[PDB]
Structure formats: C-alpha cells, structure tokens
C-alpha cells in the first residue's frame, strides 16, 4: 500500500523539492545576515576588529597577520579546460 501511495518517482520529486527549498532558506538567511551587518555597520568598524584579532594573536604567539586577507587538482583541471 505504502509503496503505491509513495512510489519512488514521487519520492524522487519530494527529495528534490526538499533540497531546493533549503537552498532557498540559505539565500534568505544570507540576506538577513547582510541586512543586520549593514544596519549595525557603525557599531563594529573593520579596523577595530582587525586590531583586536591582531592583539589576541600576539598574546597567543601566533604569527598570522590579521589585517591582511587569509586544491592543486582543481587548478590542474581548470588549466585543462582552457587549453582544449
């Protein structure tokens, strides 16, 4: 009975829909998170966060620069695509 009223085609459909709707709800949270980020832009200036990260890194003894921005198979295949 159950395999009639939920056949594999109907399941395939349901699963695709499920996935597509969670792609939507990720686009949605992204644009809520960017709305809050720009609304509160004066409360967190970039340079104060960069300086605090550097200060905490100095105390941790970590050489990674926090002001500056921070695999090969992908790059090989990219070159192949352009070369043909």
């Amino acid at each position: 009975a159950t395999l009639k009223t939920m056949n594999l085609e109907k399941i395939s459909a349901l699963m695709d829909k499920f996935e597509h709707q969670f792609e939507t709800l990720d686009v949605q949270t992204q644009q809520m998170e960017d709305t809050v980020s720009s609304t509160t832009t004066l409360t967190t200036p970039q340079n104060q966060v960069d300086m605090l990260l550097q200060e905490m890194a100095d105390e941790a003894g970590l050489d990674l620069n926090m002001e500056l921005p921070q695999d090969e198979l992908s790059q090989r295949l990219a070159r192949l695509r352009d070369q043909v």
Partner: protein, 184 residues
C-alpha cells in the same frame, strides 16, 4: 503659494542630520567593501574585481556629493533671513537653491526630507524656476556635484588605479590592464 518658512527650516535641519549619518555609514561600508576587492584579487578573479570597484567609486562620489549638499543646506540655514525677507532670489543663494532643487529627484530615495526642501523652494520661488533648475536650463547648478551624481560608468583608467592602490594596501599581487594603462 503653499510656502511655509518653518517647514523649510525644520526640513533643512533634518536633511543635514540625515546626510551626516549617511556619510559616516557609507564611509564605513567602503572600508568593508575594499577588503572584499582584495579577496577577489587574491583569488585571481580580477575581471569581477573591476566591476566591484565601480560600486565603490560610485559610493565614494556619492559621499562627496552628500558633503556638498550638507554644505548648501547649512548655507541656506545661515542666510535664512534673506529667504524669508525678500521675494526675489538673492544671487548668493542662487547656486545653493538651484542645486538643492536639481539634486532632490536624484537623492529622494535615500533622503526623503530633501523632497520636501525642494518642494518648499519651488513654492517660495516660481514653479517655472523649479523646472529650469531640474534641467539645469537655469545654468546655475553646481557642476562638480552634477559630475558626482552622473549615471555614467567611471573612466576605466580610474578603475585600474583604484585596484592598484587597493592591491598595494592589502599586499596582494595585481597586474593592471596594459591596454587601459596606455591611455594614461
């Protein structure tokens, strides 16, 4: 006429407060945006970095335009006596009044009060003068502000120069377009 001096005075003050916030906010958002340019350059996605830089140039020009309109609002407030005294337009106010009328339909998306300021100035002076301003047939609108609120794309030599300087500051390798840099 429909002109009310205290509507004009109150709204000029509101325009100044709102522009002073937008300058600050848009300056901070440019700091955040310039790091995003460095990220595209680090990823070698230079062609998109060019188009993202056009956004930063336009917002930078906009902030410079806001600073000019905030100055002309404060000038009308400083010489507000002349506005409510005379019925003729004083020659010292001509640039300020025409510019504010010209700018209003451009800026009214962000600065809602600037619509009201232009309405009141078009009530105090003639509706006809209010039309000559919007087209700059009046030949009095501030040129440097009209340039900064133009809809045209930046010169591609400016785009390259922006990328070069951002690349330097974030210590990211960049090589500019030789075809563009030849036009320097």
């Amino acid at each position: 006429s429909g002109f009310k001096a205290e509507r004009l005075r109150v709204n000029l003050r509101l325009v100044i407060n709102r522009l002073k916030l937008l300058e600050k906010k848009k300056t901070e958002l440019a700091q955040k945006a310039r790091k995003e340019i460095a990220d595209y350059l680090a990823a070698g996605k230079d062609e998109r970095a060019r188009i993202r830089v056009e956004h930063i140039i336009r917002e930078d020009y906009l902030v410079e335009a806001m600073e000019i309109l905030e100055l002309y609002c404060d000038l009308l407030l400083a010489r507000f006596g002349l506005i409510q005294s005379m019925k003729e337009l004083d020659s010292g106010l001509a640039e300020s009044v025409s510019t504010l009328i010209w700018a209003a339909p451009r800026l009214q998306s962000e600065v809602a009060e600037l619509k009201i300021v232009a309405d009141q100035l078009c009530a105090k002076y003639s509706k006809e003068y209010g039309k000559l301003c919007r087209t700059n047939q009046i030949g009095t609108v501030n040129d440097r502000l009209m340039h900064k609120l133009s809809v045209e794309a930046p010169p591609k030599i400016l785009v390259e120069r922006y990328l070069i300087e951002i690349a330097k500051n974030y210590n990211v390798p960049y090589e500019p377009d030789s075809v563009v840099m030849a036009e320097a």
